Amino acid sequence: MKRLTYISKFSRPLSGDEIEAIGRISSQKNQQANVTGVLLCLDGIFFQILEGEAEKIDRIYERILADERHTDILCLKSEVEVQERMFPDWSMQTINLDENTDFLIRPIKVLLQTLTESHRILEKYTQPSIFKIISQGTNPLNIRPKAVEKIVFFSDIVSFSTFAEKLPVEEVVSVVNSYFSVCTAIITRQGGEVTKFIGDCVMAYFDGDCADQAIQASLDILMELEILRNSAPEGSPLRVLYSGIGLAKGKVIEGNIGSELKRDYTILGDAVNVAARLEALTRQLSQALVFSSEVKNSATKSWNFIWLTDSELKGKSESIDIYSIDNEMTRKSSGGLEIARNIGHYLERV
Amino acid sequence: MKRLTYISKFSRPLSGDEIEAIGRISSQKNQQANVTGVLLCLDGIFFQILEGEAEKIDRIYERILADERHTDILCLKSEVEVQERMFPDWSMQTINLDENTDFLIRPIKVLLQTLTESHRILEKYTQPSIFKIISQGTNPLNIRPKAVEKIVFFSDIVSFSTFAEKLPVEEVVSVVNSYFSVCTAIITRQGGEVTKFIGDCVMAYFDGDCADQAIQASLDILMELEILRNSAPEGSPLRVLYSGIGLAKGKVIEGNIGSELKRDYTILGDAVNVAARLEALTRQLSQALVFSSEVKNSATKSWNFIWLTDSELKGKSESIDIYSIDNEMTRKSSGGLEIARNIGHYLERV
Numbered sequence A, B: 001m002k003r004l005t006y007i008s009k010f011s012r013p014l015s016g017d018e019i020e021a022i023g024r025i026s027s028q029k030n031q032q033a034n035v036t037g038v039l040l041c042l043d044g045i046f047f048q049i050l051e052g053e054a055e056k057i058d059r060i061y062e063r064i065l066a067d068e069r070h071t072d073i074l075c076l077k078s079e080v081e082v083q084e085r086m087f088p089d090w091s092m093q094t095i096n097l098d099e100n101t102d103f104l105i106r107p108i109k110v111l112l113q114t115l116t117e118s119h120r121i122l123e124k125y126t127q128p129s130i131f132k133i134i135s136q137g138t139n140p141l142n143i144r145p146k147a148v149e150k151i152v153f154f155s156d157i158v159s160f161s162t163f164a165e166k167l168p169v170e171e172v173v174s175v176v177n178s179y180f181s182v183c184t185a186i187i188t189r190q191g192g193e194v195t196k197f198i199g200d201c202v203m204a205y206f207d208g209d210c211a212d213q214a215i216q217a218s219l220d221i222l223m224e225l226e227i228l229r230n231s232a233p234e235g236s237p238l239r240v241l242y243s244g245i246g247l248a249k250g251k252v253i254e255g256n257i258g259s260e261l262k263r264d265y266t267i268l269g270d271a272v273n274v275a276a277r278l279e280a281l282t283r284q285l286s287q288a289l290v291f292s293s294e295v296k297n298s299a300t301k302s303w304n305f306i307w308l309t310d311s312e313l314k315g316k317s318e319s320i321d322i323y324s325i326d327n328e329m330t331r332k333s334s335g336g337l338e339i340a341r342n343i344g345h346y347l348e349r350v
Ligand SMILES: Cc1cc2nc3c(=O)[nH]c(=O)nc-3n(C[C@H](O)[C@H](O)[C@H](O)COP(=O)(O)O)c2cc1C
Pocket: A022, A025, A026, A027, A029, A030, A039, A046, A048, A050, A060, A063, A064, A065, A066, A067, A069, A070, A092
């Protein structure tokens, strides 16, 4: 048996009668599927527990995810190998706590609402990967550190300091947040983890055998930024949003790193400095994407690699062969330094 | 009227009779103080709401904070200017939810326990400054970005890469976490905010008129690390834990920066790169603390300033006069580079 617990937000005001109707239809369908559970609502939040055979639960959950009446759905707990039902008599019991005025329920209602409001704010400041660990029954704070091979991804906005000097503060934050949204969506789609934002820079990582996905994510980010620049409104600062990207591979420490007050689940190791140094090299090259030979040698697809004769690294141990991809993007550029001049002239005049 | 809502963890197993006795004594004292509220417990967690005149609530709360029977106390909500009691008939009503088996309470119990467990994990990955904003009734996600003057603090471990190469992974993480705990405790004590960990580096900030506190925090960190090095056990890697510190002042953007998936409440601006560049300069100087003339000129105490003739910055706009403090610490050092050699020889032999 499987049991799922999730919370969600009303997409729109729902009357008491609409909530009842959801419970009625839910009861009718769940009974046929030998599914049981409970549905609670409180001040625009749904809480639901569903239990039954895993095959049936998975299908019902997918349907519920498509329901336009709620949004921001977060699974808090996914129990598998369950051997005893919690709510055996309830195909779907619906409890509208807004309408309840029992005396002993009152203080529990207040606490649940206060905790939920706080939880839903903290979710926005937490990486989603933490939630999947929690939902599976593991406390991420107890994960022991391990050494593991990763592909490290660094991307950094070109000449961001210019934006900050020429634009109102709200517009500056809008540009950087737009950049982070573009990169996060594509990295996550390719199976990477965005682990930290460092000013105008994205730090992410992929599994050590996922060089092909790291390369593809990088190429797709560069293409998305070109579309964004070309399709932005007249006078928009997004027209001069450019990035570099550097990739490196190596053994890093993955674990909980920080103080008693605040920790991060993240990585530590030399491959991080190598990726950051390679990203910085793009300011001196025509190419916006650079990566080390270890990344090139770990790829399995027949990428259009180009070997670059600009291995002037610093801080390394024995230098590094540098590669890029030769396509329409990394080829037709004004290079770096020329781009930085272009950004200042454009922003001076808007 | 004031109303406080907090959660805490049992410091030790408490029997049902001990919880009742807490409620009895609480009832007797609260009645005299015209305080009302409710006390709930569930699987080793306390939840309490207290309401009454602010003067009385503050005193009672301080006493409760000293009670050895609970720990990890977090105030979730602090309401001031309250005009109506929630629980007027209850000096302190005690509800042991572990012992309750009402039927309708059952699903609420499960949700509350699931949400609380998740909340308490997320607290460890969140900066405490976020919680104080929430508890005051403000949603930090809705704070608009603003330009503000700050003192930016950077500190970075000397030759950390050596630790990572020579020690088992668990010991490496122990060293960096010990360093972060030392810095966080002192920065917070002096009114600073630790905003990000970047590998082996602490990024923090102070209000723009708090140069004296930023300097004092830096000096106290250097003194604490010397005590730690001298008092560590034979063979401990903490014996060769050294740091640099750089401070700079300038106008930065403070606000929510990130993606729809994850954001940070943090700062952005040129003063950050200046502080990071100054910290890096300590590797070439005998001094472990460097700061810009804007920090020196904003201090109000008669510090023992020394003007350093090593202003060879890069990436700035018009260079920078560099200062330190001339005391026993910044004076008697082997300088940088010499320290890096010392660390490798020591760790090679343990
Ligand atoms: C919070 C919420 C919870 C729901 N829970 C269930 C459920 O447990 N079982 C179910 O069949 N439908 C549930 N639904 C409804 C489905 O999303 C969908 O409307 C319904 O299954 C379609 O039924 P129909 O195709 O027979 O019209 C829920 C909807 C919402 C907004």
